[PDB]
Amino acid sequence: TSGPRDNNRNKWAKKHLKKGKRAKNSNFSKFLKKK
Amino acid sequence: DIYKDETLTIPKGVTVDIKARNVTVTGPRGTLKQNLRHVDIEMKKQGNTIKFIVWHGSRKHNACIRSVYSIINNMIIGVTQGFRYKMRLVYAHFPININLTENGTVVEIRNFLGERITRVIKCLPGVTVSISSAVKDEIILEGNSLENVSQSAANIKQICNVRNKDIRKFLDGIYVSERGNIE
Amino acid sequence: PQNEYIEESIRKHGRRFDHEERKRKKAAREAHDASLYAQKTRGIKAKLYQEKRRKEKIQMKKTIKQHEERNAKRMITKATFVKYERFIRPMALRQKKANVTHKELGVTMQLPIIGVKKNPQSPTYTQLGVLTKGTVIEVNVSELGKYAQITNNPELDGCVNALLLT
Amino acid sequence: SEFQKVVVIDAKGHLLGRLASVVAKQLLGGQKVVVVRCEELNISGHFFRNKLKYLAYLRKACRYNPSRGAFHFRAPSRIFQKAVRGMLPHKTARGQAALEHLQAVEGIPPPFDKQKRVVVPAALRVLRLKPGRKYCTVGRLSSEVGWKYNDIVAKLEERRKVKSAAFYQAKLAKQKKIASAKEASPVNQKLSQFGY
Amino acid sequence: HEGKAALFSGVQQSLDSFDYMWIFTNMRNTYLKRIRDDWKRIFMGKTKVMAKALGNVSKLTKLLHGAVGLLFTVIGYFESFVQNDFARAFTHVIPAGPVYSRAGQIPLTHTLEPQVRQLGMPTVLKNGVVTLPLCTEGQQLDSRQTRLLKLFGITAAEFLGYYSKKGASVEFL
Amino acid sequence: FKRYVEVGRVVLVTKGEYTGKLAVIVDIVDHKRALIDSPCSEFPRQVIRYGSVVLTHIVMKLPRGARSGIVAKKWKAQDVCNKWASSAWAKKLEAKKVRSQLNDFDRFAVMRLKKQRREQVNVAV
Amino acid sequence: ALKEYQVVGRKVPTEHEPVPKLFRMRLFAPNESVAKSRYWYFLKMINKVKKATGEIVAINEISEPKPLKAKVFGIWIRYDSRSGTHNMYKEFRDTTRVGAVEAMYADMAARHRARFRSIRILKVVEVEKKEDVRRNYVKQLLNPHLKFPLPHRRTKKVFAPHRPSTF
RNA sequence: GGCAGUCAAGCGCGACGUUGCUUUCCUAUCAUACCGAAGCAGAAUUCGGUAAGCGUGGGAACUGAUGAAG
RNA sequence: AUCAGAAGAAAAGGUGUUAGUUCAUCUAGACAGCAGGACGGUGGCCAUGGAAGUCGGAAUCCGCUAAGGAGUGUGUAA
C-alpha cells in the first residue's frame, strides 16, 4: 500500500484526477448553476 | 592576491547586457534572461567583450569566477549557435510509445517494457523536443538554454528509469548519445 | 546470470546503451566521494572506515616503499590447576592444558601442566595451584620436564598463554 | 539624535539581533517604537542556519498539560517581538510597561504608510556583514514553518509601492516648481554668504 | 634536461657528420626505423632544440622548425618516393547497415564487439551485428574521422639544402 | 564611475586632525596604509589609512613617489584646487564650514533672508 | 607601541679577565626596562653570562632614517613552540622597522598564537631586490599597474534618516 | 583478543604489516516504505543505506464544567 | 560549523582551510590540454580446451630509437 504523505499514491492520482472526476464535476456544476 | 580577472570576447549576439544584476543575454536566435546572483563578481563591459573580475578576494569566491565565465559562454553558445541534442531509444520486444504534445512540451510516453503507466515528460521552459525522423527510436530536442535542455533529457532519462530488475539482461531503454549545438 | 551462458549471450544481445559512460563518470566521481565519506561519517562506523583507511594508507606506504625499492564466602574465583581447601575452585575454572610457547623455538603449542612450581601471589595460592601471570609451573618437556613463567594473565584472558622459562 | 514621541523603523536590510538591541534600549529610554516591514529582516547565516535553531525550539514543550508549554509563535512580527522580550526585564513592572510601547507589525499598515520611516545605521546588513555572506530573510523563513500569509503580503506591499510611487512623482513635481522659484527669488544668490 | 642534453650532444656530432647533408610525420615509428635501417639515422628529438644548442647558421636557425634530422644513407628517393600511410588529425563514405573494415573491399569483419562501443557513432548492434559519410574532400581532417579512418583503409598521407663540410651552402630550394 | 586607489589619486582626510583637507595619495604600501601628501604646508607628508579617509573622484597624473615640491609643482600645473571647488561635493562641505561660523545675529539675519524669500511663491498659476 | 633599542654590555672585569668583550643587540621593546631584561635573556642562552655577573653599559633608540619611504622587510624568527623548535622567515611590507615587528607579532599571535616570551626574534634585514621577494601577495602590491577599490568601507547618532550610500 | 618472534612510522622501543595454538521514550530495524550492491533471467534470497511514522532491541498540579469582569 | 565557538576518547582521516619549511624542474616551452608516434626477435619457456603483454609461474634478455612495460589495465574463447 502507501502512506498519508506518500507521493506514489499522490503522483498517479493527480494524473488520474485530470481525467475521470474533474470533467464530470465541471459537468455537474454547470447544470447546478443553471436557474 | 588583489585581482582575479578573466574576459571573454562578446560575439555578434544582440545583447551581452548585465544591467540591473541580471544576465539578459540576447542573440540571433532569441533572447535569454537569467539571474546574476551566483556571486558578487565584477561584470565589466569593454567594447566587444565582457570582463569578469574578482578583486581582492580568496579562492572560495575566486573558484566561482570561472563558472560565470562558463555560464555566460554557455549562454553565448545558446544565443549564437544554440543547442540541439538527439536522444536514442532502445526497444527489444515492447516498443516504447512517444507522443509530442504542446508543441513538443508534453511528452506522452508509454509502453516502456509494455507498462500501462502513462509517462508524461513535461519539457523545461524554452526547449522543443521532437521525434527524429532520420533514425528510428531517436528523439531530437533543441533549444536556446542548454541547461534547461540538458536537465529535461536527463529528467527524460530519469522518467523511464529501469528498476526492480537486473540491469544486465534488461538492457533496452532510453539513452542520450548526441549533445551538441543548434548550429 | 553471469559470464557462463549470459555474457556471450549478452554479446549477441548487446549491452546497455550507456554502459561505459556511466562507469567512467562514477570512476571520476570517486576521487571526490572519499573526502565527504571521510568528513560526514561519524560514530563507530566512521572509525571502522578509518581503520581500513589507515590500513590502506599503511598498505600504500609500504607499497610505495617497495615500488621505490623496486625502481632502485570462602571461594576461589580465579583459575586453578588440578581444612587446607578453605576456598572453592570450580571444575570449569580449573585448567589442565596451556598454550606453551617455547622461548627458543617460538612454537606456541598446547601442552599440559605437569605441576605448579611457584605462584608469585601467595604460598597458599601456590598450595592451591591457582593460575596467574608470572607464576612458575612445572610442564612436561618430553614431547618438546621443565619450568615456565606465565607471560599472559590467564584470569582476564581465560587461556594460560605461558612462555617457557628455558 | 532623536527624541521623537514616536519613531517608525523600517526594517528592510537590518539585522535581527542588532536592531532588537538598539530598539530595546530606546524602549527603556521612554520612546514609542513601531517596526514596520518586520517581515523583511535579516539574520546572519544561511537559510537553514536559524531554521534548525528554531525547529529545535519547536521540540521544546512542557511535559504537563502540553497546552501549557512554550508558545512557539510563527509570525515574522512575533519572531522579532520575541527578540525584544528577553532583552528587557519583562518580569518587572518596568519591563511589561516598556513592551506595550513597542508595536511590531509586518508589511506597512496605512496608519504608518504616510509617515517617516527612519533606519538604524548601526544594525544594517550592507554595513555590518561581509559582502558575499550567507544570510536568511525572516519573512521568507517563517513562511516555511507555518506563517501561511506570505502570498498576500507580497501582493499587498506591491500595491502600496506603486501608490506611494504615484505619491512621489506628485511630490517630485512639487519641488521642481520651487526649484525654479528658489533661484527666482534673487535674494538667494546675493545673500548666500550666510552659508545658505 | 639531461635527455635534451643527450639530443643536443648527438646533434652536434650529427652536424660534424661526413656528408649527405640530410635535413628530414604521420607515419609510424617503424617507418623511421626502416629509414634508419636504410641508412649506414632516425633521431629528431625536439624541433629547434639543437638550434638552441647551436645558436649562414643564423639564417638556418630562423628556418629551424618542424620535423628535420641529420642522416647519411637518397636525394632522388626523398623527392620521388613518399611513404603512404594514415594521416594525422578524399571523401570517404560511411557504408550504412552491415559494414566491413575494408570499406567494401572485403569479398566483412562485422564482429567488432569492443570497437563499435568504442566508436560512439550512430550504429545499432542489433543481434550482435552492427548496422547504421565517413569523411569529406576539401575539409579539415576530423579527429573522429581520423579515428574512423584508422579503422578504415585510408592511407591519405604521402610521408632543401646541403649543409656540406666544405661547401656549407644550405640552399632554400 | 567606480573610483579606485591609484598613484596620485586625490583623497580627503575625513577622520583626523587634518579633517577635511584635500590631500593626494603618493605610494600604495599595503591594503590598509598608503603614502599621502598635500601642497598645503600645514599638512605634513605621512601615512593615512583608508579607514579614516574618503576617496575623491578627481585624479591627477604623477609618477611614483615624488618629493613634496614636485607634488606642489604638479599640483599648481594641474590645478586640483578650484577644480575640486567646481564640484557640488565641495559646495556643501565648504558651506558646511561657513554655516558653522555663523554667530547668533547672523543666524538671526538668515531668518530675515528667508522671510524676504518666502513670499516669492508667486508663480505661474 | 614599540621602540627599537641598541643595547651593548659586558661582565664585571676581573684580574683574570681585565677587558670583557662587548656584545651588541638590535631588538624591540615597548620601553627600556624590558629591553635590558630581554637583553640578559638572549645573552644568557648564547654567551652564558648570568645576570649575577654582567652589567649594562648603554641603551639608545634607533629611529628609522627613512620613515617616509616604502620598504619590504624579511624577518628571521626563532619561535619557541610547545615543542620549542621553529626557525621562521617571513616578509612584511611597510615603512618602519618599528611598525613591521608590531605586525609581525600580530600575525604570529593569530595563526600560531605566540606570546611575548614565546618569541625570540633573530634578524631583521631590509630586503630590497624584487627578484628575492618570495611571497606572492607581497609581490603583487609592488607592480606598477596596481589598483583596487577600497575595502572595509563604512564611509553614535543612531536613527539615520535615509539609507547609507555605501558606494 | 591475548602470549612469543621478525620486521620498521619515527622518536631502546616503534604503528599498520608477517610467522607460530587457542503509559511513554530511545535507534542500535524485528517487518512494512524506498533505494544501493551481489552469478541479481524471473521468482525467491543475501548484504548495505535512509527510515522508530505505524506495527511486530532497550528506558520510566493532571482532565472536566460553571463563573464575574476592559 | 546541517545546534562551530565564547579532561575521558586524540591513534589517526579530510580532493578541508590559511600561512610556512625542504625539494625539483621551468619561453632548451611549466602542469594541463589536445593531434600523432607509442616498433621489431616474439604467439620467449612452462603454463592449456582456450593465454598473442594483460588466467597465469621463474626469468622477463634483447636490434631499434625521442619511446615502447614477455607488458598499464580495459577486452576477446583466443
Curated annotation (Swiss-Prot), chain B:
This is Large ribosomal subunit protein uL6A. PROSITE patterns: RIBOSOMAL_L6_2. GO terms for biological process: cytoplasmic translation. One of its GO terms (cellular component) is cytosolic large ribosomal subunit. Belongs to the universal ribosomal protein uL6 family. InterPro entries: Ribosomal_uL6-like, Ribosomal_uL6-like_a/b-dom_sf, Ribosomal_uL6_a/b-dom, Ribosomal_uL6_CS2. The keyword Ribosomal protein applies. Keywords: Cytoplasm, Nucleus, Ribonucleoprotein, Ribosomal protein. One of its GO terms (molecular function) is rRNA binding. Component of the ribosome, a large ribonucleoprotein complex responsible for the synthesis of proteins in the cell. The small ribosomal subunit (SSU) binds messenger RNAs (mRNAs) and translates the encoded message by selecting cognate aminoacyl-transfer RNA (tRNA) molecules. The large subunit (LSU) contains the ribosomal catalytic site termed the peptidyl transferase center (PTC), which catalyzes the formation of peptide bonds, thereby polymerizing the amino acids delivered by tRNAs into a polypeptide chain. PANTHER family: 60S RIBOSOMAL PROTEIN L9, 60S/50S RIBOSOMAL PROTEIN L6/L9. Gene3D superfamilies: Ribosomal protein L6, alpha-beta domain (3.90.930.12). There are 2 genes for uL6 in S.pombe. SUPFAM superfamilies: Ribosomal protein L6. It is found in: Cytoplasm; Nucleus. The keyword Nucleotide-binding does not apply. Its main location: cytoplasm.
Curated annotation (Swiss-Prot), chain D:
One of its GO terms (molecular function) is structural constituent of ribosome. The gene is rpl1601. This is Large ribosomal subunit protein uL13B. It is found in: Cytoplasm. It comes from the Eukaryota. It holds the Pfam family Ribosomal_L13. Component of the large ribosomal subunit (LSU). Mature yeast ribosomes consist of a small (40S) and a large (60S) subunit. The 40S small subunit contains 1 molecule of ribosomal RNA (18S rRNA) and at least 33 different proteins. The large 60S subunit contains 3 rRNA molecules (25S, 5.8S and 5S rRNA) and at least 46 different proteins. One of its GO terms (cellular component) is ribosome. Belongs to the universal ribosomal protein uL13 family. InterPro entries: Ribosomal_uL13, Ribosomal_uL13_CS, Ribosomal_uL13_euk/arc, Ribosomal_uL13_sf.
Curated annotation (Swiss-Prot), chain E:
One of its GO terms (biological process) is ribosomal large subunit biogenesis. One of its GO terms (cellular component) is preribosome. Keywords: Cytoplasm, Nucleus, Ribosome biogenesis. InterPro entries: Mrt4, Ribosomal_uL10, Ribosomal_uL10-like_insert, Ribosomal_uL10-like_insert_sf, Ribosomal_uL10-like_sf, Ribosome_Assembly_uL10. Transmembrane segments: none annotated. It is found in: Nucleus, Nucleolus; Cytoplasm. Belongs to the universal ribosomal protein uL10 family. Component of the ribosome assembly machinery. Nuclear paralog of the ribosomal protein P0, it binds pre-60S subunits at an early stage of assembly in the nucleolus, and is replaced by P0 in cytoplasmic pre-60S subunits and mature 80S ribosomes. Associates with the pre-60S ribosomal particle. This is Ribosome assembly factor mrt4. It comes from Schizosaccharomyces pombe (strain 972 / ATCC 24843).
Curated annotation (Swiss-Prot), chain G:
GO terms for molecular function: structural constituent of ribosome. Gene3D superfamilies: 3.10.20.10. GO terms for cellular component: cytosol; cytosolic large ribosomal subunit; preribosome. The keyword Repeat does not apply. Keywords: Cytoplasm, Ribonucleoprotein, Ribosomal protein. The keyword Ribonucleoprotein applies. It is found in: Cytoplasm. GO terms for biological process: cytoplasmic translation. Its main location: cytoplasm. Pfam families: Ribosomal_L18A. It comes from the Eukaryota. Component of the large ribosomal subunit (LSU). Mature yeast ribosomes consist of a small (40S) and a large (60S) subunit. The 40S small subunit contains 1 molecule of ribosomal RNA (18S rRNA) and at least 33 different proteins. The large 60S subunit contains 3 rRNA molecules (25S, 5.8S and 5S rRNA) and at least 46 different proteins. eL20 forms multiple interactions with RNA and proteins in the central protuberance, connecting components of core functional centers that are located far apart. Belongs to the eukaryotic ribosomal protein eL20 family. There are 2 genes for eL20 in S.pombe. This is Large ribosomal subunit protein eL20A. It comes from Schizosaccharomyces pombe (strain 972 / ATCC 24843). The lineage of its organism: Eukaryota, Fungi, Dikarya, Ascomycota, Taphrinomycotina. The gene is rpl2001.
